[PDB]
Design a binder for this molecule. Structure first.
Ligand code: AMP
Ligand code: AMP
Ligand code: MG
Ligand code: MG
Lengths: 173, 171
């Protein structure tokens, strides 16, 4: 897949950053190469339309690297994007949940029954995405799927999110 | 009418995060696809009319600037480089105080021309640090842009002589 190759060639890996043991996957080059970024968004959008048809109401982007992809993915799908932030950043009444640290969402971000897909750059343990799903569930929204560019399969984040479906463009151990 | 589509989706919260201030919340712009599209289109039209073919990259500022940078870059046919809170980026970096921002040393080459984007200009401290970092890579900052500007805080003056443009102004 030519388009998927355009994304994979723009992920750079940094052993022992930010601490010894972690291999950091840097999506910065995907953003810098407009063909790579277009490919990533298109692949995610095609998957989501093929899987959910017209059932998605909103994309939810996760602070902060998910913000890089959420609005462009939403736009490609003809949808709005809602924000899930690190605690302390949002005005108005909020709910919050531990993700490791805490994520937060505005109490009026969604109405009950609205259907949402969550996007982040990378799934590791699944703590961050799981916190997002908890918050969305507490607004009585339905999480249709979580998606990312990168998935670290040895950390079993997919299993943590089950039964919420998960999809990634690229997998590393 | 496009600008109206953006203005009508800014929501103002008094006394957040401290008493006396008004927080301008861009969340409803993001939530309404027509409003977001209008905002990106107005910024892009400004930048093309002002700079023609001179822009090489957009630089988006962590975190809310990340919401607009990539879409703006895509609309202009350009890539987007990232300026982050210190500690977040791998590899060789430069940093600048103001809290600290950081950029990867290979983000830009000497001579490359960039426009910086963030959601809101207040005191101008954040954008000023971004411009400092970019100048230290020997990049040229053509302009800084935002959706919202708080004019009583004199951010524009802080940035001078780097040009600045906002879609919307509040005291
Ligand atoms: N190895 C890694 N490289 C880059 N980002 C990471 C890495 N591990 C975790 N992250 C970031 O942390 C979150 C995923 O961690 P987790 O909550 O364990 O799934 C995402 O928001 C990622 O941006
Ligand atoms: N009144 C405000 N409402 C919303 N965001 C603000 C406000 N003041 C400052 N900010 C944020 O802080 C940064 C600008 O602060 P400054 O460095 O003073 O220009 C931007 O990233 C804004 O998102
Ligand atoms: Mg993250
Ligand atoms: Mg900011």
């Amino acid at each position: 897949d030519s388009e998927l190759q355009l994304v994979e060639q723009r992920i750079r890996s940094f052993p022992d950053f930010p601490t010894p043991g972690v291999v950091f996957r840097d999506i910065s080059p995907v953003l810098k190469d407009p063909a790579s970024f277009r490919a990533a968004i298109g692949l995610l959008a095609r998957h989501l339309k093929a899987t959910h048809g017209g059932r998605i109401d909103y994309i939810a982007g996760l602070d902060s690297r998910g913000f890089l992809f959420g609005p462009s993915l939403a736009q490609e799908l003809g949808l709005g994007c809602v924000l899930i932030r690190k605690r302390g950043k949002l005005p108005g009444p909020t709910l919050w949940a531990s993700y490791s640290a805490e994520l937060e969402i505005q109490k009026d971000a969604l109405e009950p029954g609205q259907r949402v897909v969550v996007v982040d750059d990378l799934l590791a343990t699944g703590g961050t995405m799981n916190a997002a799903c908890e918050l969305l569930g507490r607004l009585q929204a339905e999480v249709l799927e979580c998606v990312s560019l990168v998935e670290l399969t040895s950390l079993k984040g997919r299993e943590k999110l089950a039964p919420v479906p998960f999809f990634s463009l690229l997998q590393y151990e």
